[PDB]
Nucleic acid binder design. Structure first.
Lengths: 150, 51, 52, 126, 108, 139
RNA sequence: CGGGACCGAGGACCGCGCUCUGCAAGGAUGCUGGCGUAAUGGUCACCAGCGACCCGUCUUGAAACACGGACCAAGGAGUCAAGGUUUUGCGCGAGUGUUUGGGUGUAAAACCCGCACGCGUAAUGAAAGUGAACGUAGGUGAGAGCUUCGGCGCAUCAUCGAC
RNA sequence: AAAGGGAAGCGCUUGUGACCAGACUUGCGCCCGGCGGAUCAUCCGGUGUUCUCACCGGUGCACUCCGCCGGGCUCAGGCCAG
């Protein structure tokens, strides 16, 4: 016998989505290829967020995007791996290029009416395969009723 | 332009008429959503039983 | 087939959903020039020789 | 035809795993059940007792599900079923299902002879 | 469904005051902040107002028709004159409407 | 668009009507499936370019998908019957599988399937009589 | 320099090398004999050598005591509803929820409709009541990622302010 | 059919007796000889296709192809062993 006071630890993170969405499976295959064959850390972070559950992908609003588009970020491509929602408190939407997992109808309409562009993540993979000149944004994780109750 | 689809006659031959393909045929194909809705929907005609 | 579009326009509160993937051809995306031109060189083959 | 070349077939254990006390009680089937009593000698693995099944007895992955001829059994119900083995006559052998009639068995055996496919139970219903 | 339950796997191993006759309709006064005020305007005319295609006309917003009784004062307004008809209003909300160039009218 | 070979494979990789699943392997009944095995490489009904070989009365009959007629099933197949020397059949099948980039990964399986069908079309030899063995069977 | 035992995993080539026409160098080949069948192999019954308490329950720390078991077949015990809570998948998203009801129907299905309503979008106080931007929605230290290589800084955390 | 000098039953391993499942029976490739036929190569026309690959009709006049039958040779073949 061998004395092993320490214990080998199995992985405590997701390695695959629990979702059965076929298009998400295709996206996961594409970003597995990109994070294996490139050196860009952007692709690895994107792959990990594609694995995540919905409470780990809180929505990002247009006012949050407009806040982060200030101070030299007006030309960077915004990348969100969750839903982008509309904020009707934001009366003037700036021009922006946003790639998201999905958009709400009003958010897509307001971005296109302001003159920006909405992209899917596979179009993002085509145009920026190394994540150059991008702004990777997350929504508020702890802004949940249960997390308040913790 | 949008794609077209051929109209066939009663003899099985094309009539020369075409129609624009509706946009619903380009909808995403989601078997997980279809399975969830089908599992729910197939129980809606059930009659109750009890001893 | 001519009435189908009006059928789907008349559904209140529903729009035809947007997909999370724009191009479903994964082979076309992966073997496109935009992705292939920036990849690192392969670090191995599909089969690995046994060393010792 | 002869099977594809393979490593020798090794069975780590050929004897079955008999249920404890099924030799003494007729109401107990011999099929294996794990003893769950806290003081059970088979569960505690005292020597001289029945062995318990475990993953260490597992067969070689290269020879799992191989019959001694080197083929893998594939159950067939008709001629179209046996025609699925057209590209696998060196790896798969056809076993005709028990409820297939004698005439259909004759048809299956003739087609499998043409395809060069071994039939495991070719002499039944003759 | 019964086949997914853990039981199947475990087979083989087992102050203040009291208010009598409270009528909630007395205390009905839903509130809306001024940062949501323009969302009550329909989208097309709202877009014309925010762009600047209506320089000689002002919108009149009836909060009671939208189901609100009090205008509260969270947020900021654009520099567009708005007439607001409300049953109640906070001091900050009235101040911000007046700086925007409109007027808060009281209704019942 | 919304439809591709990858999408169809993700839709039908776990179940379809051609699937034959048993303990010793998973097989496919698909006509455009050489080797009759369930995989993306051999799923001819899934793939945009695909080949399939069936026996004829004499020789083989090879079908190939036409990429411009995928929505027209009655005119989607390019069909050639080879009833000639086996070497000529192998040459033409390998040519339509590899010379123009139409599934060069399938040319070994296609030539093998044609050879198997032509071998099965030969007359069968009579088997030797069964030798009786032991004591109870012999007597 | 002899003598003996057990073992032969892998399966085109690629490597490290050497005594370099080649090799003992990233895992056994070559030569030969008998037999080609119950001979090898397997199952069952029995003898032989060695091994081996009767199961379940209960109790305590444990045994022991005690309790149940003549035998076999069939039956036989964590279910359903309402309401919470956390987590997973899905739709829509500052909204969301067609199915009380109405329309319709190939008629207990499916499809369609909307007023009200519920929950959320504002809190706090016993109550009367009042009600959330000084500032690119603040300062400072971190922080993935991006960067024009000067910086910009997500989530989140810590700390000082503001309403 | 068998066992039995105050229990049987069970585990590991031989042996005896009884009873069995497989495997094997030859295949592939060459070199000769004899048959039986021209779905040999090239060219022409049509058709289809992956647009350069095929099929079909004419052309072969037998040192070319395709089967069959006799030999000879190489290789690979079952079980236990030296």
């Amino acid at each position: 016998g061998i004395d092993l006071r320490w214990k080998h630890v199995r992985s405590s993170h997701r390695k695959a989505p629990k979702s059965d969405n076929v298009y998400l499976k295709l996206l996961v295959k594409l970003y597995r290829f990109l994070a294996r064959r490139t050196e860009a850390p952007f692709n690895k972070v994107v792959l990990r967020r594609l694995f995540m559950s919905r409470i780990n992908r809180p929505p990002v609003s247009l006012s949050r995007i407009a806040r982060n588009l200030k101070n030299g970020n007006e030309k960077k491509t915004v990348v969100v791996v969750a839903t982008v929602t509309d904020d009707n408190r934001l009366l003037q939407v700036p021009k922006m290029e946003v790639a998201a997992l999905r958009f709400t109808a009003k958010a897509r309409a307001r971005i296109e009416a302001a003159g920006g562009r909405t992209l899917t993540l596979d179009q993002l993979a085509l145009e920026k395969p190394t994540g150059a000149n991008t702004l990777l944004l997350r929504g508020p994780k702890n802004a949940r009723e249960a997390v308040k109750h913790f | 332009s949008r794609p077209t689809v051929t109209v066939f006659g009663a003899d099985g031959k094309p009539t020369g008429a075409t129609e624009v393909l509706p946009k619903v045929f380009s909808a995403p194909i989601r078997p997980d959503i279809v399975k969830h809705v089908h599992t729910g929907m197939a129980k809606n005609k059930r009659q109750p039983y009890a001893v | 087939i001519k009435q189908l579009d009006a059928v789907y326009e008349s559904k209140k509160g529903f729009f035809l959903p947007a997909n999370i993937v724009s191009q479903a051809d994964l082979s076309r995306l992966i073997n496109s020039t935009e992705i292939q031109s920036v990849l690192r060189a392969p670090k191995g083959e599909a089969r690995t020789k046994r060393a010792c | 035809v002869a099977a594809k070349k393979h490593v020798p077939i090794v069975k780590k254990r050929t004897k079955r795993f008999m249920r404890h006390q099924s030799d003494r009680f007729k109401c107990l089937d011999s099929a294996w059940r794990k003893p769950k009593g806290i003081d059970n000698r088979v569960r505690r693995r005292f020597k001289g007792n029945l062995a318990m099944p475990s993953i260490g007895y597992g067969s070689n992955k290269k020879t799992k599900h191989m019959m001694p001829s080197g083929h893998k059994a594939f159950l067939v119900h008709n001629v179209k079923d046996v025609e699925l083995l057209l590209m696998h006559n060196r790896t798969y052998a056809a076993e005709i299902a028990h409820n297939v009639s004698s005439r259909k068995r004759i048809d299956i055996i003739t087609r499998a002879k043409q395809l060069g496919v071994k039939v495991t139970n070719a002499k039944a219903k003759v | 469904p019964t086949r997914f339950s853990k039981t199947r796997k475990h087979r083989g191993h087992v102050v203040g005051m009291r208010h009598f006759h409270l009528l909630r309709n007395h205390y009905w006064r839903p509130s809306i902040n001024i940062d949501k005020l323009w969302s009550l305007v329909p989208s097309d005319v709202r877009e014309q107002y925010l762009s600047g295609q209506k320089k000689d006309t002002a919108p009149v917003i009836d909060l009671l028709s939208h189901g609100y009784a009090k205008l509260l004062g969270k947020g900021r307004l654009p520099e567009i004159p708005v007439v607001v008809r409300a049953r109640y209003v906070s001091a900050e909300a009235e101040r911000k409407v007046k700086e925007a160039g409109g007027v808060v009218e009281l209704v019942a | 668009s919304n439809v591709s070979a990858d999408l169809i494979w993700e839709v039908s990789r776990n179940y379809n009507s051609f699937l034959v699943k048993q303990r010793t392997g998973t097989f496919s009944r698909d006509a455009l499936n050489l080797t009759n095995q369930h995989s993306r490489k051999h799923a001819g009904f899934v793939n945009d370019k695909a080949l399939g070989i069936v026996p004829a009365e004499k020789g083989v009959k090879v079908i190939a998908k036409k990429v411009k007629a995928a929505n027209k099933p009655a005119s989607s197949l390019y069909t050639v019957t080879y009833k000639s020397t086996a070497r000529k059949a192998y040459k033409a099948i390998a040519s339509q599988a590899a010379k123009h980039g139409y599934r060069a990964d399938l040319r070994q399986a296609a030539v093998a399937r044609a050879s198997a069908i032509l071998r099965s079309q030969r007359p069968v030899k009579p088997e030797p009589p069964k030798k009786l063995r032991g004591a109870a069977a012999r007597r």
